[PDB]
């Protein structure tokens, strides 16, 4: 149990590294589309 629990600690740590990068990539594209929407919709109109 404790051997597999030890392996599980490493997998939780790997998800910790992954979830940080997921927060960096997702937020970057939300903000990039948010700034570009306003000049685009100033030409005529567009939704985000």
């Amino acid at each position: 149990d404790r051997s597999e629990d030890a392996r599980a600690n490493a997998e939780l740590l790997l998800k910790g590294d992954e979830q940080t990068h997921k927060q960096r990539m997702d937020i970057a594209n939300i903000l990039q589309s948010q700034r570009q929407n306003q000049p685009s919709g100033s030409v005529a109109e567009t939704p985000q």
């Binding site: 149990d1 404790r2 051997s3 030890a6």
Partner: protein, 48 residues
């Protein structure tokens, strides 16, 4: 003569009892010693 041979039989039983005590208690020490290996096996799993 008859009292001497009766007391000799009783003395022989204390020798046979002493023979069992040395053997049986040795195995009883080893019973506890082998149990400590199982205790140490539990502690090593926790620290992992």
């Amino acid at each position: 003569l008859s009292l001497q041979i009766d007391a000799a039989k009783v003395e022989a039983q204390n020798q046979l009892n002493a023979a069992r005590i040395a053997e049986i208690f040795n195995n009883m020490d080893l019973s506890k010693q082998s149990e400590f290996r199982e205790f140490l096996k539990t502690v090593a799993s926790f620290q992992q």
